[PDB]
Amino acid sequence: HAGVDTARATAIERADQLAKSAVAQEKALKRAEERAQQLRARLDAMQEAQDQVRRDSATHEAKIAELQATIERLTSEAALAEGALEAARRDRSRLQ
Amino acid sequence: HAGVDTARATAIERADQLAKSAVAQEKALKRAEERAQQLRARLDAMQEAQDQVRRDSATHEAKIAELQATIERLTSEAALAEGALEAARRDRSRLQM
Amino acid sequence: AELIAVRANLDQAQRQIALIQAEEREVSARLAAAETALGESDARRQTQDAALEDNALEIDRLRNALLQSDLKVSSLDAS
Amino acid sequence: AELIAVRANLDQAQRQIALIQAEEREVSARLAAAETALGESDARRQTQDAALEDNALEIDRLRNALLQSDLKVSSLDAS
Amino acid sequence: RRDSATHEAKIAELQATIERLTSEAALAEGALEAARRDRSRLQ
Amino acid sequence: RRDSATHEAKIAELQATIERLTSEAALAEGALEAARRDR
Amino acid sequence: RRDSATHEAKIAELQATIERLTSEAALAEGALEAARRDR
Amino acid sequence: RRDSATHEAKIAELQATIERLTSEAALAEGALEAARRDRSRLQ
Amino acid sequence: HAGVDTARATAIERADQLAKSAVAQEKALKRAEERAQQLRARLDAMQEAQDQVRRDSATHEAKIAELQATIERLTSEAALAEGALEAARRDRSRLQM
Amino acid sequence: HAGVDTARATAIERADQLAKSAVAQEKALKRAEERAQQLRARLDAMQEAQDQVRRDSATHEAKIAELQATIERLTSEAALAEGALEAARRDRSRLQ
Amino acid sequence: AELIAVRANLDQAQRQIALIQAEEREVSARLAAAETALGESDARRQTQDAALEDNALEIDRLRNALLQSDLKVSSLDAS
Amino acid sequence: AELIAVRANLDQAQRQIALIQAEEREVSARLAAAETALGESDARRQTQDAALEDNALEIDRLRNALLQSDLKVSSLDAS
Amino acid sequence: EVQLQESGGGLVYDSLRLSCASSRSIDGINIMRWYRQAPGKQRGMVAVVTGWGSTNYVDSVKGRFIISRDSAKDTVYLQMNNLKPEDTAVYSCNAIYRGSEYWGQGTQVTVS
Amino acid sequence: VQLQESGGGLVYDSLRLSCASSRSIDGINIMRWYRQAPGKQRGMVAVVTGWGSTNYVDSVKGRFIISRDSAKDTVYLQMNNLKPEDTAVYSCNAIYRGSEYWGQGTQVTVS
Amino acid sequence: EVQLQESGGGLVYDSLRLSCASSRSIDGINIMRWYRQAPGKQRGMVAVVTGWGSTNYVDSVKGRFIISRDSAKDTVYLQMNNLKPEDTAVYSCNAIYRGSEYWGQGTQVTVS
Amino acid sequence: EVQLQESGGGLVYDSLRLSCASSRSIDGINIMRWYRQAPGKQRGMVAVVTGWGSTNYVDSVKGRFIISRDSAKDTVYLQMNNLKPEDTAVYSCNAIYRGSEYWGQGTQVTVS
Amino acid sequence: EVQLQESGGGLVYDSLRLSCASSRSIDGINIMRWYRQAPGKQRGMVAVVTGWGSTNYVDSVKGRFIISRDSAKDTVYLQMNNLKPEDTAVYSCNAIYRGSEYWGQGTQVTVS
Amino acid sequence: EVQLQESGGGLVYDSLRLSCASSRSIDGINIMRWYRQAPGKQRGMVAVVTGWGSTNYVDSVKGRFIISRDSAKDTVYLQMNNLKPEDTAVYSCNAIYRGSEYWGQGTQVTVS
Amino acid sequence: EVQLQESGGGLVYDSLRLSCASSRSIDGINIMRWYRQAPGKQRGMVAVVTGWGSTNYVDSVKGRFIISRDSAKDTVYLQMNNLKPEDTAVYSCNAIYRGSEYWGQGTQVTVS
Amino acid sequence: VQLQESGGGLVYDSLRLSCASSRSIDGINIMRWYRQAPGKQRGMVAVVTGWGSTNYVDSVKGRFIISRDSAKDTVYLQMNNLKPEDTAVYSCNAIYRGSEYWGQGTQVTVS
């Protein structure tokens, strides 16, 4: 009679504890999925964050291109300016 | 013992079925944590990539500012060059008039 | 200068068209295989689950058959 | 000159670069989602396959036990 | 008589050479006043 | 007879004025033209 | 005389019920009190 | 007579011991129903 | 020679007085240029001092941002700590009620 | 007669050339004074530029002081929180 | 902690008061000497310039005296 | 507590620090201006001192020449 | 082989009466005790009665219920008084004659 | 009546507990033995009756034996196959003329 | 020292909006917290907003409550939508300035 | 390519304001210059404003003329105050975008 | 990507010491704290150290343990003193850098 | 020792006349030439006359001025015709008799 | 604070080469140009080099001189080729860094 | 009349220039010598007269000597203490019966 009225005790233990406990396992699945979906939201944000800073550096690169473009054809203007000075100051060789 | 024999039988598989429902979930978190670490590695690498471009834009502004202060000088030199030297020359070379 | 340079930029265009073919390769292998197997395995999911409900009903009914058979064995033995 | 007809094709170039980037990103995200979902689906399928194996074994064994039980019932009533 | 006649040519000469030695002066100070005009470029 | 003496007075005076013209030529034609072209 | 026999019928029946009470005491006072305090 | 008299005490005893052996039962299941009430904290 | 002798005399000192008015001005520009180089050295030193403090403010913002992302975690941990663990404990320790 | 009608020529040269030329020397004095007064204007501007950035770093230093002040007394709150957990989880020692 | 610390900050106050005495030292030596000598040298500037105008008048008048004396010498020698 | 009476003196401290900075800067700028102006003033004074030396020499010499000239005038008229 | 059929069931807002019909035992009525079954719970103790009349009651009902024999009518009464809503239970009388236990079909009293 | 028991001790088994009584050769009704594990409420262990009917609580059935000896006038308790949970204080009880009587108590401990 | 005083407390069957007005720190705002103390139970936290708009909630209130700063009004808010009868408590707004923690009286909000 | 067209030209005894309207480069402005060509004389520069507000003038016009950008109007200005009869000229506004230099028609301003 | 590594674990009757070998953050060290997971129980915090060196412990170890940084060698130290056999637990280190929380593989400390 | 006193001065918008009175030399009138002094400048040449009458003129006045003797009245005329405003000068007649030069006090003619 | 230093000067009949030893600006090199002061005349520009390497010369040297950078060794180079005795002049280097213009002590080049 | 001169050359001094004439022993009035430094307008140098009066431009006074010899019928020009600026072409002139006559010209150069 004896071993069965007792042995149910070690059987209910799994069925009650794990029924509630495995739900805590299910919450972690949602939590670790929430952490995954939150970082996945950030990754698209940082790619857009990459995109603006990708264009920002390109706009800076064009600003250097335009700035050296001025200098390249503003030192040339000075190159002809000193040719004008030396040609005109060569005129004073005829008199002095 | 009349009805208990079943509850021993029934609740062992009720235990046993949830005995392998735990191993399945354990493998589910051990794969969901690995998928989290793939995302951490990507964002960490993309966090430093954004940081590298941050002082890349900073060095560009250091180039811009110093490439402006040079043009501030070339425009200033042309003032004395094109303005004083050139106009005075043609005003000194007004002797032909 | 600009002639060769921007013909080379159109060559960059053709290179990125090769990258278009790379994207089409991703869709042609990876996405296609992924969703085909996903449909198959979800079909098998539904079939398995229906069979498992039938399986549990079978176990319950035959187990109750054992309970009644044990009761009858016990009574006839007590005789 | 010719820049009119060459920058037009550079414009088409960068249009298709935008197509490259957008379609590649959307395909990559869809592929990651599909691959993870397919791994999970296959894991569920194989857990249920193990369940089916164990439980088909259980049903065959239980039916055989019930057969033997009814045989003992018949012998008892013959006693 | 004869010697007085020789005087006439010399007087007719001396007055003649004065005519075309002053004629150089008119062309002379014309260029001196054209040169002094160049002093406008200095004053 | 007497008129002869006046001819030399025409020679003397008219030849002395040619001296003055030549002297004024030294200053004008050679000197101040050449000197003041240089300045 | 005759009434004596009924006294044992009072002894017998009243002593058999004390058996049942003691048996029900085994389940209640000792068993289910001690057993179910633990659970 | 004398032996019948001995019967009376035993009956007077047996009914008496039942009175204070059931008296324990009233205090007994009072604590069993107080213990089973603790199963509210589990169910 | 009647009046020229004076103009020789007069214009030599008019030359000579302006002969030492040039040395005086030459020393005036050679001291005004040195005062310019004192100013250049100060501004150049003060230009680099400002630059040093520029990335001093940049490192501070690098400290601020990373000292915020830590508090974003401590506040996040306290959510599970003070919220889940504590409230559930007192809800599990409601057995006394 | 001769050496004086000529020697005036070498004397006028100083008096005319230097009269105009020394004025160009005077303009440089104003110019080098303008350069000096312009840089002197900048130096006061950069000291004011130092002043704002002097306070800006100090404001940043107080922000770090306040931020670590939170952490110092937000990790302490976690220190007592785990004492509450361990004290309450010491209560379950009495039962299990 | 704050007690000693901000009494030390008041000690910083007293140190900067010593720097106030440093500023007063600058004014007491440098500024004072500078403007005193500036006033003196500008006074001497005005005196020098007035004397130089008188000096130039003296040179002009005595030089004209020489011119007339030379003319008279020349005339009397020509006699 | 006491912070009321201690931060008051720290406030006075930083007030006088502002006084230090402002007065030191204004005195330093004034000192630089005064020193440069005094150097220029002394340079002008010494240039004019050299002028006075040379020109006093010139006047004494010129007057002596005029004296000798008039002596020759007198001797010529005595001839 | 005495057969006990319970009685007295019903519903109240009150104070109800309960009886336990007995198949035999006129005046030889040994322990007749009353048990109520809390729904979804175990069976309970209420009171006892004896042949001589010593009736005791469980602590939760003491001073409220009264259990009295009816020797002629062969039935043991379980009076319900000063009722509380916690008494809604399936009520079952119990017997001990010749040492054997004889329960009944049980009735119900809803107090709510 | 004076009920005095014996047989207690700390032992490494089986054991015998008696409860000496004061009167009533065969005349006392139910005698019982109660044990109190320290920190726990006292509970019943064995029961004997005038005629010899016996019972035990299921926690000790098949192990503890309740017995009588009318000549020596003492209810025995053979207490065999002791388990470590059988450390408790064992006090004999009784019902004579209704009034319940107890004993000083003896303790048995095992380990 | 900062004085923290709440507002918005009351009773409904609905939804609510708890707000907390402070004494200094216009947008120079570090951790400000909102707590609640169920009767006879220890104080507990629910929402945290920091001076940068970063927010977190305890698992009990997420999806329902939203905490929102307002620098200009020198006040932090704590929205409460889909209020449940279990959420009744006394709500004390908190802040950490200069290290030490400063509290408020609280507002007993009942919902039932 | 940029088209540069001036405005503000005219004749006075007074003061003037010369302006130059462009075709692109809204505030993305590099060197834009203002010239003048006295009759029978070569072209000469007077003022330079750069896209950052830095300005310089030739020694002839300083203290009188002020050059001022205006990003919004896509136009650069060149003020002319205390105009002198010697300042008469044809004024062409200039700009350097993409390296190469682009000119304008000019506006003959006479002042006499 | 700080990659910690714990060290110094083992078995004592006294005194012990633990390390957490950080793989980066030379002096850029914000919160680095120590966690013990009692055998069969959940993780718990023990001591906290910060960049300024603010060290604050849990009551169960306060006055017994010391959390001391070593900023030169990229390692944090938890000195263990006057132990109890209650301290038998697996000890692991934590680190927050850029918000991300990094653990360490851990070491086991058995004291008894 | 002939003494020459100039004449004919004045002012015009025209055509003026000039005379040079002579102290002696009736009919023995050798070179009588006329010199004008440009103000602030050197003296100039205008024309000559001789005893016989050959009169030449400087290029700047040729075809405009006429210089004619008056032998009886002992005076040499310098006619001014088709005048220009550049002729404002101090006018001085010159003589050569016996080789010596005899100037005069000079007069002025303003043409403006 | 770039501190230049010229080198390579001397005397030739051919070919020469000049250096401008910069004391800072490793590759941070904006405009660095070469100036010659003809003996008794004023300073003039000869060649210009830039960070991108844009080299543009004056007509008097164009096609004869080369201005070539050496970014590794902090020196700029003016190669001199096919000279004339007209090139006898003192040659000095210029540099613009942070707007400030820096000269060099200079070297004398005598060619004849 | 034909005026032909001589004496020209390039020399390291003093020099003599004659201008041979065609007629008029003592009968021609003013004879003069003109020089033209190349690139410069021709200018007068010396003057002789029928009676023997002479003059020179101040640029050559005390150096150049103009002389006559009525027997040989040729006007001389002693040209002594030459200076490097005296490189010019020296052409004799004349005034006979008013009409000015010139000569082919001779050049003297010095260095």
Residue numbers in the entry:
A (entry chain K), J (entry chain A): 350 to 445
B (entry chain L), I (entry chain B): 350 to 446
C (entry chain O), D (entry chain P), K (entry chain E), L (entry chain F): 85 to 163
E (entry chain Q), H (entry chain G): 403 to 445
F (entry chain R), G (entry chain H): 403 to 441
M (entry chain J), O (entry chain C), P (entry chain M), Q (entry chain D), R (entry chain T), S (entry chain N): 1 to 13, 789 to 887
N (entry chain I), T (entry chain S): 2 to 13, 789 to 887
Manuscript excerpt for this entry:
Crescentin is a coiled coil protein that is required for the crescent cell shape of bacteria such as Caulobacter crescentus. Crescentin shares biochemical and cytoskeletal properties with intermediate filament (IF) proteins, which form the third major class of cytoskeletal proteins in eukaryotes. To better understand the relationship between crescentin and IF proteins, and the filaments they form, we have determined the three-dimensional structure of crescentin filaments by cryo-EM.
Cryo-EM analysis revealed that for both versions of CreS, purified CreS-MB13 complex at pH 8 polymerizes into regular, unbundled filaments upon lowering the pH to 6.5 in the presence of detergents, such as CHAPS. The register of individual amino acids on CreSsat was assigned based on the binding site of NB13 on CreS and the observed patterns of well-resolved side chain densities. In the presence of MB13, CreSwt, and CreSsat similarly assemble into a “supertwist”-like filament, where two intertwined strands, I and II, are related by a two-fold axis perpendicular to the filament axis. Because the megabody bound close to the C terminus of crescentin and all N- and C-terminal ends in the crescentin filament are located in close proximity, this enabled us to obtain a reliable structure of that part at close to 3.3 Å resolution. The structures of the WT and SAT versions are very similar, except that the SAT version is slightly longer because the helices contain one almost complete extra helical turn.
